[PDB]
Design a protein around this ligand. Structure first.
Ligand SMILES: *[C@@H]1O[C@H](CO)[C@@H](O[C@@H]2O[C@H](CO)[C@@H](O[C@@H]3O[C@H](CO[C@H]4O[C@H](CO[C@H]5O[C@H](CO)[C@@H](O)[C@H](O)[C@@H]5O)[C@@H](O)[C@H](O[C@H]5O[C@H](CO)[C@@H](O)[C@H](O)[C@@H]5O)[C@@H]4O)[C@@H](O)[C@H](O)[C@@H]3O)[C@H](O)[C@H]2NC(C)=O)[C@H](O)[C@H]1NC(C)=O
Ligand SMILES: *[C@@H]1O[C@H](CO)[C@@H](O)[C@H](O)[C@H]1NC(C)=O
Length: 233
């Protein structure tokens, strides 16, 4: 069995650079399956699609493999100054057009990109898990702020529409960050409020697996242990 990971610098090998790392690098130790980390820094649901990276997973995924998809950090902003990452606003079948990189691009909503990827994989027999984005440092200001982005609820919506599994990685990470406290969580964010140090990436991976165990996600079948701190939500 293979587990394919799709996401951004919060998941990817080498993180956002400068000594940071992504949570996907800490998962294989806890799974009896092979992990393929196809996350890449800087990507959004839009740009991951445009670059053919969902298609590349589709080519190689087979029945019974898992695909975990987690976007949101790079999906906001303004199409008026199109950075190639921002999705069209909305939750459904809305379309936006913008010239980017020499093309008048057709741009979908965040849920539509995820639903489309999910359909591709599901029709081949893969088990798709959509996961909400991780939080930026919720202790940046010295007290704890739980401020989910719109992309958290959008991932849940996309899973419901596509008929696949949802894991609320956001909430499980923010729950453990609240309990770890100001000093420790700030130490996970060495250069900015997004990219985690190796210790933080490990915590973030553990929180994904806590969510899986607590929610009963299908991936539980390949987990090697359930010994993770925190509580079920
Ligand atoms: C929540 O946890 C926080 C993190 O643990 C904790 O904040 C830390 O508190 C300790 C104790 O007071 C401070 O340690 C003291 O630091 C001063 C020197 O401080 C100044 O220099 C540091 C280092 O600057 C260099 O490195 C950083 C990081 O790479 C660069 O950004 C920077 O450009 C330099 O190269 C700097 O981090 C400090 O900055 C904080 O403070 C200034 C205002 O004073 C803010 O403007 C800034 O946003 C930031 O908050 C500061 O410029 C040293 O003289 C002492 O001996 C002692 O070592 C840590 O500085 C402080 N760290 C941070 C990240 O804040 C919070 O207190 C805690 N919050 C709550 C409400 O409890
Ligand atoms: C981009 O394509 C759309 C769809 O055909 C069109 O409405 C829009 O005018 C095009 N944009 C540019 C700036 O011409």
């Amino acid at each position: 069995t293979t587990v394919y990971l799709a996401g951004d610098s919060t998941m990817a090998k080498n993180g956002g650079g400068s000594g940071t790392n992504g949570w996907g690098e800490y998962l294989a130790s806890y799974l009896s399956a092979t992990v393929v980390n196809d996350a890449v820094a800087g990507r959004s649901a839009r740009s991951y699609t445009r670059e053919g990276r969902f298609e590349n997973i589709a080519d190689v995924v087979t029945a019974g493999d898992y695909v975990i998809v987690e976007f949101g950090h790079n999906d906001g902003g303004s199409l008026s100054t199109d950075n190639g990452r921002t999705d069209c606003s909305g939750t459904g079948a809305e379309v936006c057009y913008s010239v980017y990189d020499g093309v008048n691009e057709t741009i979908l909503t965040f849920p539509a990109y995820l639903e489309n990827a999910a359909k591709l994989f599901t029709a081949k027999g893969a088990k798709v898990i959509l996961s909400s984005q991780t939080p930026n440092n919720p202790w940046e200001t010295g007290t704890f702020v739980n401020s989910p982005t719109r992309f958290v609820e959008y991932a849940e919506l996309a899973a419901e529409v596509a008929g696949v599994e949802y894991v609320d990685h956001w909430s499980y990470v923010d729950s453990i960050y609240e309990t770890l406290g100001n000093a420790t969580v700030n130490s996970y964010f060495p250069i900015d409020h997004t990219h985690t140090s190796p210790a933080g990436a490990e915590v973030v991976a553990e929180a994904f697996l806590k969510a899986v165990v607590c929610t009963g996600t299908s991936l539980k079948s390949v987990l090697t242990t359930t010994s993770f701190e925190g509580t079920c939500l």
